[model samples]
Target: GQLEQELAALDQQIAALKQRRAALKWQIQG
Candidate 1:
């Protein structure tokens, strides 16, 4: 369904953002 695809897209975006933030934090501390 359309809703399912939209949710998957958002989930991927959130995951990518989360990993980027983690990398940023580690880079800042190290």
Candidate 2:
């Protein structure tokens, strides 16, 4: 149970990294 929850959170953390790059693109356009 514990590791399963941890993995889901880690997936979200990686998603954060993915979205972080999109912000850079917006800044460049601005």
Candidate 3:
């Protein structure tokens, strides 16, 4: 139960980080 929830939280954080990276890349492109 604990590990399952922890992994879920990690996935959410990973998605957020990916979004941040994409935004930064877009800025660099422009």
| Candidate 3 per-residue lDDT over residues 1-30, each given as its tens digit | 999999999999999999999999999998
- How high a TM-score does candidate 3 get? 0.87
Rank the models by lDDT, top first: 1, 3, 2
TM-score of each: 0.87, 0.62, 0.87
lDDT, residue 28, model 1: 100
Off by over 4 Å in 2: 26-30
Instruction: Assess each prediction's global lDDT (C-alpha) against the native.
Output: 1.00, 0.95, 1.00
Number of backbone collisions per candidate, in order? 0, 0, 0
Order of the predicted models by TM-score, top scorer first: 1, 3, 2
| Per-residue lDDT of 19 in model 2 | 100
Worst 10 residues of 2 by lDDT: 17-26
Model 1 clash tally? 0
Candidate 2 per-residue lDDT over residues 1-30, each given as its tens digit = 999999999999999988998999899989
Query: Could you give candidate 1's per-residue lDDT for residues 1-30 as a string of tens digits?
Result: 999999999999999999999999999999
